Paper text:
However, the INO80 structure on 0/40 nucleosomes revealed some large differences. The overall architecture of the C-module of INO80 bound to 0/80 and 0/40 nucleosomes is similar, except that with 0/40 nucleosomes the RecA lobes are in a closed conformation and stably bound to ADP/BeFx. Instead, additional density is observed around the Ino80 motor domain that is absent in the 0/80 nucleosome structure. The previously determined atomic model of the Arp8 module bound to the HSA could be docked into this density and revealed that the Arp8 module on 0/40 nucleosomes rotates ~180° compared to the Arp8 module on 0/80 nucleosomes. Thus on 0/40 nucleosomes, the Arp8 module and HSA no longer contact the flanking DNA.
However, amongst these remodelers, the INO80 chromatin remodeler appears largely sufficient to generate the well positioned +1 and −1 nucleosomes.
Author numbering:
A (entry chain H): 28 to 121
B (entry chain Z): 254 to 267
C (entry chain R): 253 to 282, 584 to 630
D (entry chain G): 15 to 118
E (entry chain S): 112 to 162
F (entry chain B): 24 to 98
G (entry chain A): 41 to 133
H (entry chain E): 40 to 135
DNA sequence: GAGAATCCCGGTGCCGAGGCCGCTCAATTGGTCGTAGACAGCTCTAGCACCGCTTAAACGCACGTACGCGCTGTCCCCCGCGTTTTAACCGCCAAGGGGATTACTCCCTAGTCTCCAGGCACGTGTCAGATATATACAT
DNA sequence: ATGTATATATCTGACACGTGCCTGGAGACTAGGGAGTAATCCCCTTGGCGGTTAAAACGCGGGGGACAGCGCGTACGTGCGTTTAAGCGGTGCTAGAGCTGTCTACGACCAATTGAGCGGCCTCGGCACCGGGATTCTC
């Protein structure tokens, strides 16, 4: 059959990791699949325009860093830039 | 010939 | 240069040293504070008045005087 | 040996890199940008999965209905501004009745 | 190398897990390390080169 | 009779979901006309997406993109 | 006749649940006919029609919340078509 | 000679006829200077930037006062109150 | 402090170019409040715009692309 | 070279209104306008190229895009003028 | 019937809006090839349409009462206007701090061969609801 | 006379785990040009002068506009009789969605070229500004 692309198992077992005794339904998997590619194209576009506004021809951590510091209203960005910097330091550590 | 083959396959599966 | 940086750093924030070993440098221009070491580190053993014009033009050199010559002995600082 | 395990993250980093290559955003892509995308994505779904979890134990149900994420997303102003313009299928209306509209 | 508090230059006992700055006692963690602005960390740790 | 196909009690349930206590009798035709021009504006984009896709029928993702177009993004 | 208690229970009973209000077959021909305006005998889709159903329900509940908020502003519970015209004009159209 | 109001009608006719800015430049760049120095330290600015936010501010003021005018007309009142601008910002999605 | 720079006749001129006939005294502080939060949002865009490019000046392109970001863009200073 | 569109719409204006001028502030306004519509239709061309996985943009895709974002009779006149323009391209 | 307050007709620098030459990159032309759009052809999912039982939802008539609406007396708070006065704005002068760009450089990300296990797809067991017995006790 | 209480006993019903598989992400090798840095020139804007001047602050007379309050009628809410045509669900038919195969021609790439739009400079008349007379709502 067709090889459909969906991150439903990823959200399913971070749900299982943080909530070990909680269930879920297939409409929920479709609904935050719509969430995560909605924000994926939204912030992929944002950085794109921005970098092009900056006249840079690439996408490193800097453009997306200012995009996620600028885009969403608050709080989640304050934890998000810290946890993303911590993620790229465990990447460069490895 | 496709409909007869599909009917034969469905009858065999049933 | 401090004679022993391990022992001098554990007593330079006490009130018996900050009366003698604190230098206040004035810039040129035209709930108690006793138990808080922030007020000792920033404004020394004298109380801080934020409304005084000559007050906020002041350095306080208490730790750095023995901290900066220790970089030669320990370059990890 | 996977790069997501090397980054210590759970959301995949090769999948978003694949979607970034042929997604026609930039002709040159850095290494840390898909990791940063996976990090902010993991943070966003971690936050609303905590919200859906406390809505689920507020209603005392083992399965998160989308209505649970409606009153999880309408209980904070940050996602009331981030997802205020959005329209949700089978979302309902949060309980909100004006004091003047109530009798007596 | 001896650990030191990055706020005061004192002897550092505790390192904060959110932003990785060593500190000496509780109150510098209360009114300096916690409410510090983002981006202050990078030239805070530039002195010991931990950035 | 496509105008009066949609029932007045359905508009009553829509009003009670919106939080309307007292509603008049002349609101139904104007509400129906506004809904007709809204769905016509949506289905114009939807049918141009069907002629985009080399298909003679409608699907899911064309209506999805037509909802993402004007700023009432569907979820 | 008991006034207001049954209306309050009614308001709570469709502000608590998430039931569908618009019937599926009337709205079906409705949008089917709006479709004929562009494409006749347009083979249709069940996901397409519940997409239009939920979009129309969301737009209706947003417009009606706008209307009853600006009616409670106007010191009168009842609704006139000028309230709907005010909500449409102020909201952007 | 002495009127309740007719000078306001000539003033609104002249202001709808004209297109000149009615907001003084010095308090405007002073207030954006205070906001910028409240946010960060030692920022530089251009003149075309501050006439651009002058144009944005006068367009947003024109739109909001048209909104309050239509809301006051539908409220059967002539004098304007902050309830109308509060409902205008609530309806438009500026605050919620 | 410096928020009264848009004083009462300036808001009166904005009202007269906006179309409102009669003005009450409570309109002025509300209008300057929404002005000082709207310009705060634009400057909030502009600070991340300036710190992105490592550039410490704010041009007309900065505010024009920022107005493009909130969907209230303006012609005359680049597109 | 610093690209702009001054002499182009000056020639167009001399074609349509041979006794009418314009100012430089207005010239910048229409420069912002042409950049805005170009960026809008190019972003639309990219996204409805990306919807149906087609790696090549042809005339019919962005033709349907200008049927999309433009309203009715302007879209009719635009598609008629565009079709006659590409047929007087492909005739030569 | 008068009066501030408008519109309209005529002179006046001016300074900011049309040509023009110099010329430098940028649009134009030609050859080549490897891949993606288009067409033909193929298999089955699923949309359309109609029949018939069930029935809860919808129409329609009857009436009743609060609420929309019409009118009224009232403070009273904004509106026009005279009087200081206080900051805005124009003209200008020098600095110096920051924007552009030239110019080499090096590294790391584009591009390609290989290969294996990560995730997708398709089966089987395992705890939650539903009817039923049933008989003695309490209401 | 009847509910019921608390355990059966069957008994389905929706949900999570144990095998295939295939394909794309990761390891390894090659290249080249995109940020990286930094120096230098130049340009503009931030301070600082000072006069002078439209315009804001302040206080005072006055007039319609907003405030609650009271009565008149009627319109939507409530209810029961009577439809009705929505919902289930079932079956039969066939368009068309979707995948595969194959071809070939539009288009990316590269090298040379010519030409036309950017700009500094030059020149001059349209419009705002000013002065004074006709004209129109308003009291």
């Amino acid at each position: 059959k067709t090889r459909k692309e969906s991150y439903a198992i990823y959200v399913y077992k971070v749900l299982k990791q943080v909530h070990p005794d909680t269930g879920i339904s297939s409409k929920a998997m479709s609904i935050m699949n719509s969430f995560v590619n909605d924000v994926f194209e939204r912030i992929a576009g944002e950085a794109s325009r921005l970098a092009h506004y900056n006249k840079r021809s690439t996408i490193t951590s800097r453009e997306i860093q200012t995009a996620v510091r600028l885009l969403l209203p608050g709080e989640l960005a304050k934890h998000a830039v810290s946890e993303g910097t911590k993620a790229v330091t465990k990447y460069t550590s490895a | 010939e496709k409909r007869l083959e599909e009917e034969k396959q469905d009858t065999i599966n049933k | 240069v401090s004679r022993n940086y391990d022992e001098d750093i554990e007593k330079i924030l006490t009130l018996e040293n900050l009366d003698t070993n604190d230098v206040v440098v004035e810039a040129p221009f035209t709930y108690d504070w006793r138990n808080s070491i922030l007020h000792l580190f920033l404004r020394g053993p004298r109380p801080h008045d934020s409304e005084n014009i000559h007050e906020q033009h002041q350095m306080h050199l208490n730790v750095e005087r023995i901290r900066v010559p220790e970089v030669i002995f320990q370059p990890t600082m | 040996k996977t790069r997501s395990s090397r980054a210590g993250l759970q959301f995949p980093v090769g999948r978003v890199h694949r979607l970034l290559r042929k997604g026609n955003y930039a002709e040159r892509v850095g290494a840390g940008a898909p990791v940063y995308l996976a990090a902010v994505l993991e943070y966003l779904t971690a936050e609303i999965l905590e919200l859906a979890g406390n809505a689920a134990r507020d209603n005392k149900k083992t399965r998160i209905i989308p209505r649970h994420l409606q009153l999880a997303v309408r209980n904070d102003e940050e996602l009331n501004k981030l997802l205020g313009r959005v329209t949700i299928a089978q979302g309902g209306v949060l309980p909100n009745i004006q004091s003047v509209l109530l009798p007596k | 190398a001896k650990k030191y508090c990055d706020v005061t230059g004192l002897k550092g006992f505790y390192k904060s897990p959110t932003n990785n700055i060593r500190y000496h006692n509780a109150e510098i963690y209360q009114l300096i390390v916690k409410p510090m602005a983002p981006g202050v960390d990078q030239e805070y740790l530039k002195l010991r080169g931990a950035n | 009779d496509n105008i009066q196909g949609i029932t007045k009690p359905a508009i009553r349930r829509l009003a009670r979901r919106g939080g309307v206590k007292r509603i008049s009798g002349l609101i139904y035709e104007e509400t129906r006309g506004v809904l007709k021009v809204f769905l016509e504006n949506v289905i114009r984009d939807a049918v141009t997406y069907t002629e985009h896709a080399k298909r003679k029928t409608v699907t899911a993702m064309d209506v999805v993109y037509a909802l993402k177009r004007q700023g009432r993004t569907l979820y | 006749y008991r006034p207001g208690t049954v209306a309050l229970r009614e308001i709570r009973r469709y502000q608590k649940s998430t039931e569908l209000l618009i019937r599926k077959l009337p709205f079906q021909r409705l949008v089917r006919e709006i479709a004929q305006d562009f494409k006749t005998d347009l083979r249709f889709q069940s996901s397409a029609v519940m997409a239009l159903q939920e979009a129309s329900e969301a737009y209706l509940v947003a417009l009606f919340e706008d209307t009853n908020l600006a009616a409670i502003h106007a010191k009168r519970v009842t609704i006139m078509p000028k309230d709907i015209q005010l909500a449409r004009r102020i909201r952007g159209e």
